[PDB]
Design a protein around this ligand. Structure first.
Ligand SMILES: [Zn+2]
Length: 169
């Protein structure tokens, strides 16, 4: 049985650098995008996804960092309203860069304001893995892939790996 999923763009596709526009109205269309994005993320599988990655250039993110896959959260027009001076290093992968993992330094805590699937405004203190994931996904909406924080040498080697990835048997 086939499954209707959204295609995930791969680095270094130029469309991953497009800046997403804000969601003006959280309508039934946006709730469907949240639904299709969550299905696409769980099937990949992965723990977050930005609409940019499926070639939908609007400020929509879904995240589920839980092991049981029982903590799905949607973030529409997210805003970092406070960031910590403290930084932590974490080895990130990315659904748009399959097979590539490297350390990234980010603020270790952020507070985000966003809209939920019902257009209500909410605020969330993020720490640990969630703090990494939300910043990773929000980077995607600004056209940023995590490999852009790596050295040019490493970006060049990743680009070569991505060409291998397309020729896999
Ligand atoms: Zn990613």
């Amino acid at each position: 049985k086939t499954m209707a999923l959204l295609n995930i763009l791969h680095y270094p596709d130029k469309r991953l650098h497009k800046v997403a526009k804000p969601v003006d109205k959280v309508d039934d269309r946006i709730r469907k995008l949240v639904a299709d994005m969550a299905e696409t993320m769980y099937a990949a599988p992965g723990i977050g996804l930005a609409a940019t990655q499926v070639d939908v250039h609007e400020r929509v993110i879904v995240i589920d960092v839980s092991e049981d896959k029982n903590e799905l959260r949607a973030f529409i027009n997210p805003e970092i309203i406070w960031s910590s001076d403290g930084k932590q290093v974490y080895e990130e992968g990315c659904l748009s860069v399959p097979g590539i993992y490297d350390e990234v330094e980010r603020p270790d805590r952020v507070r985000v304001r966003a809209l939920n699937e019902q257009g209500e405004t909410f605020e969330l203190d993020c720490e640990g893995l969630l703090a990494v994931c939300i910043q990773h996904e929000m980077d995607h909406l600004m056209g940023r892939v995590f490999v852009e924080y790596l050295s040019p040498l490493k970006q060049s080697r990743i680009k070569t790996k991505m060409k291998k990835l397309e020729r896999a048997m």
